[PDB]
Amino acid sequence: GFVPPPQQSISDDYRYITSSATRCPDQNPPKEREDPYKGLIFWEVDLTERF
Amino acid sequence: SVIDNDKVTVPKVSGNQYRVFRLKFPDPNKFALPQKDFYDPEKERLVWRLR
Amino acid sequence: YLPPTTPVAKVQSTDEYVYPTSLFCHAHTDRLLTVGHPFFSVIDNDKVTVPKVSGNQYRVFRLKFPDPNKFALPQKDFYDPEKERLVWRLRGLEIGRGGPLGIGTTGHPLFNKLGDTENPNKYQQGSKDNRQNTSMDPKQTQLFIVGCEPPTGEHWDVAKPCGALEKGDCPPIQLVNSVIEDGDMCDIGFGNMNFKELQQDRSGVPLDIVSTRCKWPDFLKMTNEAYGDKMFFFGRREQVYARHFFTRNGSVGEPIPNSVSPSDFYYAPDSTQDQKTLAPSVYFGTPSGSLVSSDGQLFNRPFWLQRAQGNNNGVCWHNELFVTVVDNTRNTNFTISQQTNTPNPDTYDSTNFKNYLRHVEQFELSLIAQLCKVPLDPGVLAHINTMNPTILENWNLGFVPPPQQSISDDYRYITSSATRCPDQNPPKEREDPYKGLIFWEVDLTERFSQDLDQFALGRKFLYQAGIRTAVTG
Amino acid sequence: TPVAKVQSTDEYVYPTSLFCHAHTDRLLTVGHPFFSVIDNDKVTVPKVSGNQYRVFRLKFPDPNKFALPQKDFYDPEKERLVWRLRGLEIGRGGPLGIGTTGHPLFNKLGDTENPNKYQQGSKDNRQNTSMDPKQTQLFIVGCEPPTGEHWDVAKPCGALEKGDCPPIQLVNSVIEDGDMCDIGFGNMNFKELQQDRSGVPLDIVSTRCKWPDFLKMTNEAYGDKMFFFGRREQVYARHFFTRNGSVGEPIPNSVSPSDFYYAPDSTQDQKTLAPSVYFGTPSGSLVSSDGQLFNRPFWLQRAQGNNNGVCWHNELFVTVVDNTRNTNFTISQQTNTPNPDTYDSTNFKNYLRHVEQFELSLIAQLCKVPLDPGVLAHINTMNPTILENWNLGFVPPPQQSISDDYRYITSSATRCPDQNPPKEREDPYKGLIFWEVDLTERFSQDLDQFALGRKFLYQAGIRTAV
Amino acid sequence: MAMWTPQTGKLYLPPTTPVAKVQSTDEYVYPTSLFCHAHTDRLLTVGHPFF
User: Fold this and answer.
1) Does the beta carbon of B26 lie under 8 angstroms from any beta carbon of chain C?
2) Belongs to which family (chain B) (predicted)?
């Protein structure tokens, strides 16, 4: 169902993203990082590479 | 939990806690199997089942 | 052991043991931007705040591909993993360049120029600190090198003489072969030489090149290497004319001889009060890379690999590829200034504005890779091993499990006190020898797609091959 | 090149129908339950406690040098033989019973099960406290020695002050004969983790209590450390006690049940907090003959791992714990004079002695391994000492060389001929201590004559010839 | 070339001799279909428990 947006989804990531000359790309807009279970603490286990 | 009024130095680990493990499985849509063309990516999707 | 034929005593083409399949993948970089200072890295407190980014640099991109021996194509068992291994072969490449065309100049505030000898009015002298602020446009150079191993560059360096020489003697020259890294300087018309070692003056060439090595690609060595791995194809386009004719100040290390009757310098000018001591004959020219045109461009065009120059017909051994780009046709330095934090003056003052210099490059790299199969028989195995042992080791083929086992003990909080170490200091297993070299490392592991028509290079490839995607309507 | 993916022994080890019985005559050991008695160096009475690991290292006769009458069933040019364990019995001789252990000076401040009033603190509040430990039975059988786990002192990432808590690490070790089992105080290095030397009873106060690492032993690639195991363990908390000492970590001043700060400011007696370092005394409850693991034959039909009971190297490790026969016998001797008519406490010397009794019986099946190129490569990758022990590998690389043989070796007209250098260097398990049992001269083909043998014959059908 | 060094050869010979082979009582003691009951009248004993 996704013609994914009608607009571009190209995100331009900067190099040296800790400096005070490219001010600022640090966490300020969210992205598709929205786990609905992110308010909850579980013992995380990654099995992506253990199959 | 042991803190020097502040940062967690020694966490609280007792046998009377819930251990809720959140397992993460690899995306089966992005996987390499013995053969891969056994499902059409335009009309079918894959999922894992616990056996 | 090892039946006839005996070990193959000549290099063979990759077309004799690498079987190509009809499976093609597109891969691309999203857009690679770099912003810096053209002349020098802006250092603050032992760290680089603004790096050196200039259009006179070698851009050596190290492209990392996904391991095809762990992939899933629209087939299940189309390659035997006991007898075959898979490798990528590059069949098409496009180097995109984003900025407008234009020429950037560079200079030295204290250049070793005594005078102008293009058209001098009369004879003169030499004092103490006769240096001037002199700028120039360098030679225009464009080049493109593609290989599976990193490019080899040449330059003239300082040799060890056979005995000693006195203080101020001429340093002996030696041609040094060295790998080209990202950020190395290309030659600008002053030659391919080490400016730090051969010119202790530090004042004889512009600021960008004054304390560094200018290298030229060793095409003579790169095309004559046995397997042809560092060079699949290349393009180059260079142009220079000499703009002004200048002299250098300093002690004359080798004087002009007192022989030769028909040249005015050598007939002793004793009769003339001004001409008694010869003016310095250590001439130098200012280079100039003439007009940058849009017609003459190497880049923004697809390059299809029909046949490579050497015995390696485009095979990306080790799952790596090297792209070396230079273009001094988009080297426009952007002159940006800032005011004093209070812009409350209503009048102009030269102490009220702080001027700065920036350069911005933009690249986008699109590739077309073809899968290939190598069926590793005894003789093919021996040939692959003798060519390069790391190729046949880095895919584990002829290896059993060692009797010890490989159970790793991984702690969940590897930064905590009381667990001994970070445990992984020594880099024993699978370290490429390119640990000592700096490249623009580009990861294309997650960028491979089989949907060719979707991408700009991929539908150019489909037009060139005469194919179109099957209809969805 | 050769292979990947560890395969079952059932693919390259071909069984025969030849079964042999082998057993130990009777294994007795007598000692002191808590500590070894020495003079000052030489052990006069060893430590024999019912809470030790008994790790028997069984030696089998090499089946390749067995003189069979018709050997035409195997070719010693291309084949080699091995023993496969098919039946076993771990006999146990003593009566059932529970022995107790204690410390004359145990770090216990009070009883906090039910306190009639609030308490106090001085110097040396240690008490004489005894306890019965957790009940444990286990048996592990394999061709390699067992792996045990325990928590030990690690090196921290920075320096600490004097008296700070030692950081824990899970340490794997071989389990040896005379190592202590877990008794309900955990699997921990008491010597390093408790500098008090008064925190646990006398038999474990300086020991390392280890537990079998079943998680690592099942998940090893070849499955050689154990191919069968049984276990039973039971414990309850008998009494609930407190420690004495400087409190290393204070209780946080905030009460998370009520969301408030709390202090006993209104009650003068409770202002100094009592020790919140608690410990229970374990107790392994009623022992029963119904619950018994031992004195039963076990038939090893299908092993847990890829090693289906194959006794590689002519070796077998049998690891037993039996906390169900830990009855310590109290001996007394009348010293000084055997003449008084009145009891005095100074006239009698009390002693403790523990006696263990084991009997081990096995049924071994002969199996043949045909050593083709791929089988040789697989066995060599699995374990090189197998193809060293069995004459076949290491084809002879050098040629002859003269040694010049100086006739009068002890004369002063020539240089020194000394050489003769090597002491024998064979045993890789020499640093470990096991109850070494020799069964080389104990193999018999007459199964009917032995108790486990006729149990095997009855179980397999196979009645004796009339 | 390859020398013929002597060695202590260990050979096992089991059994060293066939000996006796104790057999079951079912081999020589033939059962008959004649069965007899036998019982005790009632066995009582009264005494002191300790001494």
Assistant:
1) no
2) Belongs to the papillomaviridae L1 protein family.
